[PDB]
Design a binder for this molecule. Structure first.
Ligand code: 78E
Length: 164
């Protein structure tokens, strides 16, 4: 009933490991579906081959700009940015998957993975999933970030899809 999807993470093209996510389709169906479909690539576009453009150790890893690859782009499966679905789920700790945005109701494809409890994001960013397996891989990804977020190596989603 709740999809599981995975990313295979690579560092400058070399496999690091697999991160899998439970998507909370029972609580945020529209936001979950967006990420799910972009993870399978089923519409002809999505996350495969894209990079994590901003990694800030102790805070979060942000990705999802598969159109411009620099953090300015990305697009939802809905033909336009979409509304903040709800704010039921909170940023409770490491592993929380949540939507990046440019203000209220501007969800696209960019998302972030928390690497700490970030409760100050509640009510601003829509939480729609959590890491299930491979949190250690997300932690390792932090090695390649910095205080301002620029990455020291290219951190990419070499492959991704749905497991369940
Ligand atoms: C999706 C994309 C088109 C979007 N871009 C625009 O709004 C234009 C200007 C961005 C300025 C960038 C600031 C970066 C600051 C570094 C620390 O915080 C971040 O990395 C945040 C973490 C939550 C997810 N997120 N970026 C975003 O959603 C950020 C906005 C943000 C910044 C800081 C705190 C915060 O809660 C939210 N938005 C974006 O990245």
């Amino acid at each position: 009933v709740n999809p599981t999807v995975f990313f295979d993470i690579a560092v400058d093209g070399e496999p690091l490991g697999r991160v899998s996510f439970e998507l909370f389709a029972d609580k945020v169906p529209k936001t979950a579906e967006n990420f799910r479909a972009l993870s399978t690539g089923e519409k002809g576009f999505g996350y495969k081959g894209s990079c994590f453009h901003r990694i800030i150790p102790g805070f979060m890893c942000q990705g999802g700009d598969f159109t411009r690859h620099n953090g300015t782009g990305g697009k939802s499966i809905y033909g336009e940015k979409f509304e903040d679905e709800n704010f039921i789920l909170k940023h409770t700790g490491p592993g929380i998957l949540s939507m990046a945005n440019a203000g209220p109701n501007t969800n696209g494809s960019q998302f972030f993975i928390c690497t700490a409890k970030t409760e100050w994001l509640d009510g601003k960013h829509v939480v729609f999933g959590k890491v299930k397996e491979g949190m250690n891989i997300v932690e390792a990804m932090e090695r390649f970030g910095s205080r301002n977020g620029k990455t020291s190596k290219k951190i990419t989603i070499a492959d991704c899809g749905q497991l369940e």
